Design a protein around this ligand. Structure first.
Ligand code: GDP
Ligand code: MG
Length: 470
């Protein structure tokens, strides 16, 4: 196989991450978009609807149940886990893929997954979904620490001074509940536009507003109606352009060292002298091909495993896909099932694998080698902005990095004798892991971002930054 040629025939991907409070209409809208993009067969729908007969009458609808596909989510009536859907069809630009990602707005689960989804997937586009119904909009803006502002406190400040520019779509959803109240939609747009510009430093070219109804599908593409006074674009038309302009992008895949994030892990049973581990892997950079030797580094201090890639398949997705056929090569940013073969050195019943979410996988460096750090004392290059109360030294914080979030202690504010972090500062800071026998896996490379977010124990954003390896 050419290998070099496989990278060429690979379609260029755009990732869209959906964010917003619970009941914003995210799951409904995203499922509806998938239907409009002909990713759901009428038969598939009705089979979903034949199951939905349970819900007549009910609050739920036919579109959200597409994404809320776990039994616990259907019973609870809201999303709990992030859903990743990769779309590739004739409605998109040729040689491209559109990755859509649903996230939970329910705060308990928002804190568990949504913040990490931003760091892990590193999306080109954010989609903020807002319920514009009467009273709902007003109730969702209590103080400077409301959930919507918390979202903006992250995505507004990630990768400042970056070459590639930011892209934000604000969806003014449930427009039908207000009958497209022109004065009200104008108000909400006015208010957000101000806060985005004045407080979060967004520029006109970096964001736009789109009123819509995910349930009715109004203004998603191409009483459902778009008022005569609306001159703006549809949601999908804008996604289409973003994908198109993302085509003209530099691909350094060949120069990139292979790095993967383990999203899920399962050891095949019964265990034996040689064991086989099934991994759901998000490729962060470079490329992986079956047969290659690899290293699996765990969150547990040290404790790395050597193995070989036995086979690779497409990840089990919400949309109907082929999980039977093997894949020759895995390329950034696709997600693959990876079966890893691992020889145990000693007794195999005493020693057992401790592979978990957030663990990483790289190509083998067994004897320009890839630099890898296992850090308990972590140096952070951060920048603060609006801050209610300064953060004094010795404070307990939560360090979000890639897929993991760990409690840390603030131990040193470098460059100054100050004993507290203050508003609007660019600081260098050291934090120390609290959890015993735990170490943060950090890859030192020009190709890896290592973005972080510091929050309080109450999950309120304090700062954004990067791991300072040097
Ligand atoms: N009237 C109206 N209701 C909606 C719309 N989108 C969602 N909903 C309702 O909002 C509730 C929660 O929607 P959901 O898709 O789960 O939003 P999520 O919680 O943010 O993921 C559901 O019971 C829907 O009936 C819309 O465009 N119009
Ligand atoms: Mg949802």
């Amino acid at each position: 196989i050419d290998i070099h040629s496989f990278i060429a025939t690979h379609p260029l991907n755009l990732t869209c991450l959906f964010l917003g409070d619970t009941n914003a209409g995210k799951s409904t809208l995203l499922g509806h978009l998938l239907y409009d993009l002909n990713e759901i067969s009428m038969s598939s729908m009705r089979e979903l609807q034949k199951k939905s007969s349970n819900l007549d009458p009910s609050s739920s609808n036919s579109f959200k149940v597409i994404l809320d596909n776990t039994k616990t989510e259907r019973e609870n009536g809201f999303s709990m886990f992030k859903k990743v859907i990769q779309v590739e069809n004739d409605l998109l630009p040729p040689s491209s893929t559109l990755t859509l990602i649903d996230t939970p707005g329910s705060i308990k689960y928002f804190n568990k997954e949504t913040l990490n989804s931003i760091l892990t997937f590193d999306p080109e586009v954010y989609v903020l979904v807002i319920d514009c119904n009467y009273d709902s909009w007003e109730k969702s803006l209590d103080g400077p620490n409301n959930q919507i502002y918390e979202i903006l406190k992250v995505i507004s400040y990630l990768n400042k001074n970056s070459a590639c520019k930011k892209h934000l779509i604000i969806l003014l959803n449930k427009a039908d509940l207000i009958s497209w109240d022109k004065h009200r939609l104008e108000m909400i747009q006015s208010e957000l536009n101000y806060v985005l510009k004045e407080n979060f430093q967004w520029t006109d070219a970096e964001f736009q507003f789109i009123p819509c109804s995910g349930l009715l599908g109004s203004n998603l593409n191409k009483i459902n109606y778009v008022p005569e006074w609306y001159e703006g674009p549809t949601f999908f038309s804008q996604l289409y352009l973003l994908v198109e302009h993302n085509m003209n992008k530099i691909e350094t895949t060949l120069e990139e060292p292979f790095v993967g994030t383990i999203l899920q892990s399962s050891v095949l049973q019964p265990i034996a002298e040689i064991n086989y581990v099934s991994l759901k892997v998000l490729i962060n950079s470079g490329y992986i091909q079956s047969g290659q030797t690899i290293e699996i580094h765990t969150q547990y201090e040290d404790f790395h495993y050597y193995g070989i890639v036995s086979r690779m398949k497409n990840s089990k997705q919400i949309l109907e896909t082929n999980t039977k056929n093997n894949i020759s090569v895995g390329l950034n940013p696709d997600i693959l099932e990876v079966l890893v073969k691992i020889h145990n050195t000693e007794d195999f019943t005493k020693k057992q694998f401790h592979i978990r979410k957030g663990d990483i996988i790289i190509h083998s460096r067994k004897t320009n080698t890839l630099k890898l750090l296992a850090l308990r004392l972590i140096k952070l290059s951060i920048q603060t902005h609006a801050l209610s109360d300064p953060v004094d030294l010795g404070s307990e914080l939560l360090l979000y990095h890639n897929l993991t979030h760990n409690a840390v202690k603030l131990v040193k504010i470098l460059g100054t004798n100050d004993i507290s972090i203050n508003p609007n500062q660019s600081l260098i800071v050291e934090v120390e892991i609290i959890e015993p026998d735990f170490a943060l896996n950090v890859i030192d490379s020009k190709y890896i971002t290592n973005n972080i977010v510091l929050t309080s124990i109450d999950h309120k954003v304090i700062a954004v930054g990067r791991i300072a390896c040097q």
